[PDB]
Symmetry: C4
Subunit: 243 residues, 4 copies
């Protein structure tokens, strides 16, 4: 169907070669994407992904971002795996009743049986965990996307200063090989096409560069924007304490 | 889908301009509606709503109201939200096995995804909660109703006032907050309900009306079109004016659900 | 639907006016039905009902009744209600995996919404309980039966071992009355000398004949499973 | 499907009469089948079956067998029965989320209502258990196979000995097999004319078939043990 740009928040996010920006695409963002100092991929997101550990606060924050007209998103995804050691069980069980307009990412991730098996085996037995950038690719493939453009994936710093007060108060495997091997498995297994939008990223050594279309893109500035996660009230945490 | 009169129990319930009373309509009542001293809206209810906290006792009381021919109702709704801080999990889980002829209001409330998201966000993060008067509007919409006539909704302007004396022995024993000068729940507000009502009307394209011209609600919702009709309020004598409390053995059997 | 005869194990079971016994019918029996000294209703059962409290042992016993050619039954029902104070929670939860060829009676009982509500309200709030005869009537109606003929309803070291201390007339009667008033079914009484005859219309005399086969070397007490078996099912008792 | 060869890992596994091998068949293997010193039935399995008790370790080991190309399998089955005294409950509950490409054998076993009831009654009340050979037969029948060829069924490694240093019997297994065959109208054949099984099951027809028994060199001959970190993650299911 339509193309999709999947963006991690690595430093390459600020080094996209926009001449290679595809025509007609959706955008997937994750975690502290809003910390970006400019709208490197626009204000419109098809989907935003948040880890279960901070979903409570990210959801709260997202609503503010939307009200402030800083961003808009069609879908709100929680990057879960249905694994007791990775996320809170009751959180997943009651998810749809606390966040009626959001989705459990596993609902889609699990549609890719071969990859789910691949991910689980390496995480359970070898402690290898893929990053959100790869999780988003899986969900995109599950949703039907055929051409995936990657950016902000640098296998580890960020494309912004993530050292924020509120975030620090909340959160004071991986490896390049795991992510790369996972991406190759996805591309091969589901016959989709991966492209790299960041020619200077280490990712460009493994994934084909997005074709040059002589495209152009206006990177809108951001001023007095939300650059830190918000913390809900004490009464709010009390009500959500069990999750 | 007939029209529907949704009634809270505020003092405006006793001041309905019956000249605006629609023709063919259903009636939704809630909580201590039977405390009314006159059948301000007739004996026949399409549905009655009860909060999870007192559902056990309200169900018991309802069966007595029906057996005693004081009221009749087609549906019995429990106003739940699938929120751990608002209701007992087991109660909801086993609901249909303990009350086979009743319904969990959430089964319908959740059909309105946007409103459920709206409600949950404000309740969880800002402690802003709609009242059952608004909850019933949502369930009516989910049921298919498109013309809602409101009454008995006064946003607790004069405090915890009602269209009757709610300070009854059993109710005070079961819900002690009623003994307070102002039993109104801090999370409720005139604005919250109004905005919630505005959200529903807009989002689901339904029409709202007000049967109480003298009510504070008349300042927000369009008054019902004076159809120049009559109703005739039936009087009530030696009626059930307090909630009933089940036996100790009954509570024992239900203990896991409370 | 074929006609169904629902039998309790009261003395009226031995006083059935066979002249009224229908032609093509199914038979529902419950609990210690096999204690009967004669096949008052034949060896063939459409279904047998057992209370959750002794299901473990009754199932074990039934398998012997079947293998030993004493009785046969198509269905095996456990008379549950999905009430924590009435049945073991884990027992109901895992029922179909421990007894693959049996059924939870509630799966059918719950199909009668009005009666389920009627039963639940009176039991929970007033401690009024129905007997198996009434429960079986409900299940029969839920299964699609149109005509129900009642009998055996008059309001062993092992059994005494399992049940040491081994309901009301009004409650059952009121329940049956509600059942007939609420659903599209006809109720008949096959025992004219039973008190039930004072409330339920007598089955029409059809000048029917029926040979009552005697029983010999039959199982007349419930069987008790091994301690190892009990060890495996202890969580459900 | 069509035809399937079900194999236990007894001595008869090494005494198959390949002249009687069907032409188009799938292979079902169980537990320590890889301990075989030769590929008596090929490297390709339609399905492999592991008991719940060691599934965690067997799954880990199978992935190595596959990665090292010693064997390949389409299906991975856990031989469960939905019985607390026979398997961990949380293990069964979360199974598909920990092993996305595997299957709970009971999802198929329970499709044979009569046999499920038959098995449960005798296991619960008479402590009679069936061996994997029989379990695989039931699953095979549930999957649609009509002709089942048995082998490696004879009624009778540091890692395995450390991990696992009853109620089985020829009678129970044989009676169970006969019940399955009669009840589900399928045909059972014995591929090992020198096994006691031959005394009960009709030998497979001689079709003058040929089979190449591939050798095994430097192969996995013991179960593998996951890391302590892995165990810590699966602890609740063991
Ligand atoms: C402290 C902590 O827990 N850090 C983790 C981090 O190790 C990583 F696990 C993950 O993501 P996180 O990287 O920060 O931000 C999103 C994605 O950007 C890509 N990236 C980023 C920086 C870099 N140098 N090279 C990269 O490739 C990865 O694809 C990653 O998934 C995650 O979800 O995968 O999330 C954070 C936080 O849990 C989260 O931000 C709080 O809401
Ligand atoms: C003490 C306590 O817990 N009070 C609460 C109250 O804060 C409110 F949460 C709620 O409402 P409740 O008073 O019965 O009254 C029913 C409805 O009438 C309307 N009304 C009433 C009086 C007034 N002055 N202005 C109004 O607008 C509201 O729309 C309300 O929903 C409720 O479910 O919304 O229920 C009671 C009880 O939990 C319940 O009666 C026990 O069965
Ligand atoms: C001690 C104890 O717990 N007794 C109860 C008894 O009060 C009754 F509740 C019930 O009934 P149960 O005796 O077996 O007899 C079966 C049915 O026959 C009818 N009948 C019997 C004898 C009589 N004189 N007048 C009658 O009307 C009733 O309709 C009853 O449902 C039951 O399931 O309804 O079961 C027994 C045992 O729990 C059970 O036998 C153990 O397996
Ligand atoms: C100690 C313990 O628990 N032993 C049991 C054993 O009683 C049997 F239940 C079973 O047997 P399993 O080894 O896999 O081997 C499969 C079948 O091969 C045949 N055979 C094997 C070796 C031999 N010397 N003579 C034979 O005849 C039998 O027909 C057996 O059923 C089973 O599931 O069928 O598994 C083992 C282990 O639980 C399992 O291997 C560990 O993962």
């Amino acid at each position: 169907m339509k193309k999709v740009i999947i963006a991690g928040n690595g430093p390459s996010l600020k080094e996209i070669d926009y001449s290679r920006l595809p025509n007609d695409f959706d955008v997937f963002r994750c975690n502290q994407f809003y910390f970006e100092d400019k709208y490197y991929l626009g204000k419109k997101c098809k989907a935003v992904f948040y880890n279960p550990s901070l979903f409570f606060e990210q959801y709260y924050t997202l609503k503010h971002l939307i009200q402030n007209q800083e961003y808009e998103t069609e879908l709100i995804m929680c990057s879960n795996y249905n694994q007791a050691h990775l996320e809170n069980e009751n959180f997943v069980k009651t998810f749809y009743d606390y966040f009626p307009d959001a989705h459990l990412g596993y609902d889609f991730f699990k549609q890719l049986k071969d990859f789910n098996a691949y991910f689980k085996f390496h995480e359970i037995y070898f402690n290898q965990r893929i990053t959100s950038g790869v999780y988003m690719c899986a969900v995109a493939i599950a949703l039907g996307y055929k051409e995936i453009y990657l950016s902000g994936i640098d296998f580890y710093s960020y494309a912004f200063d993530t050292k924020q007060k509120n975030l620090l108060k909340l959160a004071p495997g991986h490896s390049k090989n795991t992510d790369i091997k996972a991406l190759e498995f996805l591309e091969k297994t589901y016959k989709i096409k991966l492209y790299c939008l960041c020619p200077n990223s280490l990712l460009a050594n493994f994934i084909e560069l997005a074709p040059n279309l002589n495209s152009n893109f206006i990177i809108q500035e951001k001023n007095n924007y939300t650059k830190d996660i918000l913390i809900p009230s004490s009464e709010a945490y009390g009500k959500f304490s069990k999750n």
